[PDB]
A paper describes a structure:
In addition, the OM of D. radiodurans is covered by a carbohydrate-coated hexagonal surface layer (S-layer), a proteinaceous, paracrystalline layer commonly found on the surface of archaea and bacteria. The S-layer in D. radiodurans is thought to be composed entirely of the Hexagonally Packed Intermediate-layer (HPI) surface protein and exhibits impressive hyperstability at high temperatures (>80 °C) even in the presence of strong detergents such as sodium dodecyl sulfate (SDS) and denaturing agents such as urea.
Images of the isolated S-layer revealed top and side views of S-layer-like two-dimensional sheets displaying a characteristic planar hexagonal symmetry. We used a previously described single-particle cryo-EM data analysis workflow to resolve a global 2.5 Å-resolution structure of the S-layer within the planar two-dimensional lattice. The segment comprising the HPI1 domain (residues 19 to 131) was not resolved in our structure, suggesting flexibility in its position with respect to the S-layer lattice. The domains of HPI exhibit a bipartite arrangement, with a long linker (residues 220 to 229) separating HPI1-HPI2 from HPI3-HPI7, suggesting that while the latter domains form the canopy of the S-layer, the former ones form the OM-anchoring stalk of the S-layer. Additionally, the S-layer is stabilized by many salt bridges that form an extensive network through the HPI lattice. Although densities connecting these residues were not observed in the map, they could form a putative disulfide bridge connecting HPI5 to HPI6, further interconnecting the lattice.
Residue numbers in the entry:
A (entry chain A): 238 to 297
B (entry chain A): 238 to 356
C (entry chain A): 357 to 633
D (entry chain B): 712 to 817, 821 to 948
E (entry chain B): 531 to 817, 821 to 948
F (entry chain A): 416 to 474
The structure:
Amino acid sequence: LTLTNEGIVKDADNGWRRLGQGVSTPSDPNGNVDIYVKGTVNFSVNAAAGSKVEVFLART
Amino acid sequence: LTLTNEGIVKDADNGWRRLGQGVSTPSDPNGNVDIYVKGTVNFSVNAAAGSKVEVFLARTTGSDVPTNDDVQAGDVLRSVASTSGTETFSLDSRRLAEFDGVRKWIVVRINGTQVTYQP
Amino acid sequence: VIADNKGPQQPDPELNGVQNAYSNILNNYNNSGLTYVRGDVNVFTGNPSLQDREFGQAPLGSSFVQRRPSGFESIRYYLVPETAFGNKALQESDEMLRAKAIKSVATVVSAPVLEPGTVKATSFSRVIGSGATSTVTPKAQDNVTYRVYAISRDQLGNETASATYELVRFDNVGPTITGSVIRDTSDLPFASQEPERCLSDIATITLGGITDNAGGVGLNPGQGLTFTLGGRQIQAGQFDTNQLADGEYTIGFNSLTDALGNPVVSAPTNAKVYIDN
Amino acid sequence: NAGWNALQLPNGAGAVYLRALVVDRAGNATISTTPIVVNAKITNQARPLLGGFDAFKRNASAQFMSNSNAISGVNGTAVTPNTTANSALDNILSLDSVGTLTTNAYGATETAITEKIRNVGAYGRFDATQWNRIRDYQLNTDPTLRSAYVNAGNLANQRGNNWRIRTPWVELGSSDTANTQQKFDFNSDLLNDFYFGRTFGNNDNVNLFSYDQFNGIVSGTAGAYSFYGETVQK
Amino acid sequence: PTITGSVIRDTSDLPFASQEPERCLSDIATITLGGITDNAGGVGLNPGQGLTFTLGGRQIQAGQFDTNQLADGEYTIGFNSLTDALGNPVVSAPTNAKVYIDNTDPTVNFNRAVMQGTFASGERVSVESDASDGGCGVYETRLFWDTDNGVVDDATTTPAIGHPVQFARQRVTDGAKADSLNAGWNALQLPNGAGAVYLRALVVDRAGNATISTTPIVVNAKITNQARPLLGGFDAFKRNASAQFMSNSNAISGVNGTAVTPNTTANSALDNILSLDSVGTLTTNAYGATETAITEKIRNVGAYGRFDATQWNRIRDYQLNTDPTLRSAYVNAGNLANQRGNNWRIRTPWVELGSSDTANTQQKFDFNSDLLNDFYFGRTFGNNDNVNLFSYDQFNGIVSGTAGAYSFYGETVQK
Amino acid sequence: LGSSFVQRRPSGFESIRYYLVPETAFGNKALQESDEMLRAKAIKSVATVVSAPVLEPGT
């Protein structure tokens, strides 16, 4: 979800974007930078040729 | 709020000053140096040219329901898609009056990734 | 990864007038829930307390103690002609679907508002301009009834549409007045060579009228303009010309604006008549 | 795949059934059910308080009434389905924000640990007559039940176990934060989104293909909830 | 033939008078119209012939005129040109004054303290409100906290007061189109009690258009909050007189031997003093302990002046039943009536005069005032006549501790 | 709860000043009484004899 010249993210039903956050007041500031995803997103995994590859959600 | 020759701060409805404190007796001394603000104060943020800049009060997200602390759309102090190198915004010190006398942070986000804080 | 598949809370559009020379506002017209505007109107969000969803306490053992949605990003305003909603196949339910439907049939679209604005301005203010005098963009069209919707979107682009809309119409054209004439109807003792120029004794006057443009707000009820000849007030019908002195005289009229205070667009020129008794 | 915020009556333990309704392209419909148990939280000790509410035509004015956790008949301001583009004939369901509160909370250490209001949602009830027709067809009349090339007993068992339910509530939207008039308000033409070309093309007989009740649910962070609404004049 | 200018001015003070009674206009106005006269020694004009005047699409006559018949915006009084008996045109025309008609109350809402659960007594609450007006602009904003809602029986005071009590105020100098009031309130509650408290924002624009918005919260008494603060003797008396203390805690007493009356003059001897004895004033709320008691202190001793009941009743009646805008043909008379019936059905407010604070060398918490309402006499609006209507009818005080418990005292004003 | 300090830490007491105002100046009823900050502004407006601020309670 790239940023347009207008200042908002492009229109799409599915996508992803890396976002930084921070939270504070009253607590001391604590932040996180994470990949936020919406809809159905495609991913790629690299491995050596001929290797068995398995992908799980959450738990193996 | 500069100091006059007479020994008190100049008269103004809005302003800021950096103050050092200490507290003790009976406890061991503990001190803090903070920027105290009253009224509506202007601030400036520096960023690279062409960078999207957002400024929030307290939280960028993550409302804390149990402590009755929320993040709202109105808490955005400033937001510009493109910047020429610097941005100027305004803060009303009376916002979030629950935190009178304790620290509250201003959050600055650059390009949606880089986050900085200022108490 | 973190998942965000819900848009912010629904923004409520709200209308306010603009204080300048060329703008007037009526809130409710003829009990139709319609706001009539001349010049500029100000559209803002009535509840800037809205936050991005989904929010609350995280499940036990989570990476954070609270849920951290992508977070509120922007608000935008959409003017959609009422006639476009004659197609009942457009979606209402599922606020994301409603937002898509609104985007489908939008005609006047404002730029997105990223900030609530300064203290002196309203929350996420935008100005809609109309008429020739206004220089505010974007410009809507006259004689069209618009629904005003607001759409709020978060940092990932999830959108939600307003639970309610506003009904607005524009009118920036003033009334016009038709011509009036006076003619000689007294032949005794001998008829005038031209009743249009030479006049004597009893005369007949037919007076014009003032009407607002078709489809506009209309004139104020029970209001009609008055006519004068020379130094006297004149009513339509028979009039004794002996009541005023001799010389050249022309029929004059006062100017009235419409319900929105639009000045008269076109006024006629009446004939000059000489009275010789 | 979806998420549901669990709701339950205060200080109660119950069974809640999650149902999935799926239709194919010839109008073949199925329902599957899975049960769960919901226990009220420790904080969940009272239903949220409700202010006055009313459903009225957009060009009219509200006449609020106090009928929390119930559905009221047609009051002085009737609501009817609007088949035209005329915005004056739309329907508004409004709830007063002054009387709307949640008392659920977790003195404490100088700061009260509390529960907030999470959602104010607007729903339109599926028409009872149309739903009754569909249910009767799925239970007794479908010709497939008497089909010679089907297991008439397996099909009847699988339907008698999933289609013996009351008329559904369709999620129209969320009223959310209160407006400048101190109201949670929602606008609709009271036309079922199953029909009129939104999902299936059904136009005639507006009585059968329009909501018979305009309703709302107020739910807090503790999981407590209350409901209100008015019958549609139709 | 000479023609004189005409003037239209605002003469409708309810609910609040306009800042500029000849620019911004609201409700009923008074129009004085000029006339046409022929030059001296001339023929003297046609007989029984006069000018007709219009104001932006309506024909207007001299006298009382309801501005609700016109849209909000800028207008000028107009007239027709009439010639003399010999047909000489008009020689000179006056440029009549430009006026603005605004019959629309400001839009007001709360962003903070919404969709609420509960607060604890003694903790600060962030209260944030926004107001806007499209017409003549925002002028004055006040914030109140109230215990009771939908009650109009004045002249009564519940153990929890039951009247709106001011805790914040703000004024806009330039009449800007929008403003925001952000404040903090220290939550108060009866001991070992849980209740609903309504925060109200009252906003007036420059023609005297007034609105009220409400948001509810819940306040729970703290664990330490177990008793109301003890009150010593108190009395209200003239400055040159002497006190006659009485013991009437959590109540308001009638006129005692020492009357208090509003002072319209500069004579300092006629000022009024409200005094509370510091010897009997204590809080028993606390959290033996480990050689040091964990306790609650007294936080504030505040002095208030009650808004006059008759004037408030007049304003309330105007906002509920009499305002001409309610019968206006260009308004939603049902929406407006609903939005007012839900916010203006409140008792007369209490105006925050100040804080008595620490005790003096006489062991008293004392406050001095002339008992003139700060809404009037040029402080907020210019209202001078009838001192009875525009002066406080009660001189009151509140003692509040750190635990959030509170008690109130005061005396009726003799007036 | 959770604050950076266990108690509120206001900017802290600085000074006290004394103002002599002629009684006649209070014939103008438009001067503010309520809202102690407004009262201070009003007093400063019509002050004639003003003492230097006192920073210490003294010996």
